[PDB]
Symmetry: C3
Subunit: 187 residues, 3 copies
């Protein structure tokens, strides 16, 4: 394995880091100062966390995943997971041609769309997917592999495609299993 | 370039690693102990090889490619190649809502689907593709870029889309070139 | 941030490299002697530039992006930007079954398709996209996320899909702004 030690970790300088947080040494963490991580979290190789990013507990950010929180930030609630090679954007430039583009160029010439991105509890994003700014992913939502998400998504559904369409209900058993797991944790 | 010396290879300790095997120091190899590698194989920057993976000979695995063989294994026969940024999964979690998810939770609470992934000879996988567990990709199968493969695939066909659909037969002239090529050695 | 200093850049040995140039140390650069960079370029972690590549000025190459310039080359012009996880190939292997495949194999048995690739001014390439060889992406072209490009694209259009299709005109307003920005300089 490739993860930082508890020793190495406290030395990163996160706004917050819980316990049993496993982080690849091969990930990239920009501005840990604005990054909070709960407990039981895994962040694999070649991830990039940048800007404002909050992660709860029980979350795997699989390899190659980029979270660009910029300023408004990205929030994951507990039991959210993100599969490989996913990108989440809290800010994006305007593609229309009404705006010059990117970090090379002064702000006034651009027309950056920005907006908090939220992943609620039990959201799972499949591999190679893309989430855009200002998007709340509803509790329980499953998004398929190679998905593109530009708009908010209603609780407890499964979505696929570019851009995603609602294809079926997500089952809630998962909520019973969460309840059980916490109780095994209990007494 | 960015490859191991033949020297340093030996110091990784694969189940087995043949000759003329170029593997980027920028790859991530986990649990080399269950990975074997034949001859004339290139693995490029930022690849990941995890768990049980078996690569024959004359195979390129291109940059960013993730092979997660876990316990059941991925296996690739000779002259099989994978283009950049592919993921081969020998194990996936249940997305239905019937299970809790990922490596952060106990296995009683989950419903991991698992099953060996094999790519037969002369298989080519296009870039940005995803092969899920329990899939035999038949000999001479070509899968297009940006494709997703959840079921086994018939021999000598070209497949594309998400999930893939069969679009036409692959030419087999490469059988000849294999023969003619092995010949001259 | 993971960038080289003005200093270390000079040691890399780029054909040419201008000012305000930030390249990630996490990037891989092969054969930097055929690679050339204007001014006010940014190249992010995990990018790969390989063989012949030429970038003008005011361009961002975002993270994970692979540019395989080969011998023919890839050229971007001023104000072209490329989003994350893109790949641009100036050379590719033939999938049809008429040839054997990849770098593990002698040229005489392959059937490499190759040709210069060009991104004209103001091109924007969407995240997770692929550009095949021998194409010109028209001036002012935007190509959506997760799109695949196999042919030259007409100027001032937005294209999406796999492979792309034209969906609407790109506003030419950016020309005004390019002037206004450059005037102000
Ligand atoms: C989304 C997913 C869970 C749905 O699978 P399913 O519930 O078994 O449903 P089906 O395969 O029958 O597909 C239903 C429909 O959506 C389409 N579809 C399925 N997955 C799709 C995807 N990823 N993108 C686009 N369309 C998809 C199918 O073509 C089918 O279409 P139709 O009914 O119009 O013919 C699964 O296909 C998937 O993408 N899983 C992602 C796995 C992953 O990323 N894992 C990381 C490892 S833990
Ligand atoms: C698979 C591939 C070879 C097929 O293309 P081809 O044999 O030239 O055939 P065509 O381009 O005429 O395509 C036939 C149909 O498939 C579709 N198609 C082709 N490639 C597709 C892909 N990757 N995904 C979805 N559809 C695809 C076309 O839209 C066309 O559709 P239609 O029948 O509805 O019109 C090619 O497009 C591809 O994906 N190559 C991948 C190369 C790669 O990843 N290289 C790595 C560097 S070596
Ligand atoms: C291409 C893009 C600009 C178009 O957005 P838009 O101008 O708002 O257009 P719409 O969302 O109305 O969609 C227009 C049509 O294109 C389709 N479409 C949009 N984006 C698509 C994509 N990336 N791939 C395939 N189809 C797409 C829509 O389904 C719609 O189809 P219809 O007219 O048949 O219903 C945007 O969808 C996109 O892909 N942006 C990429 C952003 C990125 O990669 N950013 C990097 C960080 S700065
Ligand atoms: C994928 C990955 C694995 N590893 C290590 C830690 C794991 O114990 C081991 C197995 O990899 P992985 O495929 O994540 O296995 P699992 O699904 O069993 O957790 O390899 C890393 O250090 N970094 C990574 O990015
Ligand atoms: C792509 C890549 C190339 N290289 C080096 C070794 C290759 O011989 C050289 C050129 O590779 P590449 O650009 O892929 O060219 P080709 O397709 O002809 O093999 O750069 C690496 O070390 N690591 C890599 O991940
Ligand atoms: C993505 C990325 C960021 N960084 C650093 C430099 C940036 O100033 C910072 C975050 O940049 P970014 O998230 O791209 O946004 P902005 O356009 O607001 O700068 O982190 C790197 O060094 N390499 C990278 O690949
Ligand atoms: Cl990637």
């Amino acid at each position: 394995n490739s993860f930082y030690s508890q020793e190495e970790l406290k030395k990163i300088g996160f706004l917050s880091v819980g316990k049993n947080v496993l982080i690849s040494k091969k990930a990239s963490i920009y501005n840990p100062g604005v990054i909070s991580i709960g407990n039981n979290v895994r962040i694999d190789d070649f991830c990039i966390l940048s800007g404002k990013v909050t992660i709860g507990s029980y979350s795997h950010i699989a390899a190659y995943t980029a979270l660009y929180g910029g300023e408004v930030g990205i929030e994951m609630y507990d039991f959210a997971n993100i599969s490989s090679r996913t990108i989440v954007y809290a800010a994006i430039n305007d593609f229309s041609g009404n705006a010059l583009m990117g970090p090379t160029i002064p702000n006034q010439y651009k027309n950056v769309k920005t907006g908090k991105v939220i992943l609620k509890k039990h959201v799972i994003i499949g591999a190679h997917s893309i989430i855009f700014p200002n998007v709340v992913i509803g509790e329980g939502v499953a998004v398929g592999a190679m998905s593109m998400v530009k708009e908010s998504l209603d609780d407890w559904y499964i979505y696929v495609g570019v851009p995603v369409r609602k294809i079926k209900a997500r089952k809630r058993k998962i909520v019973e299993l969460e309840n059980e797991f916490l109780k095994s944790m209990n007494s």
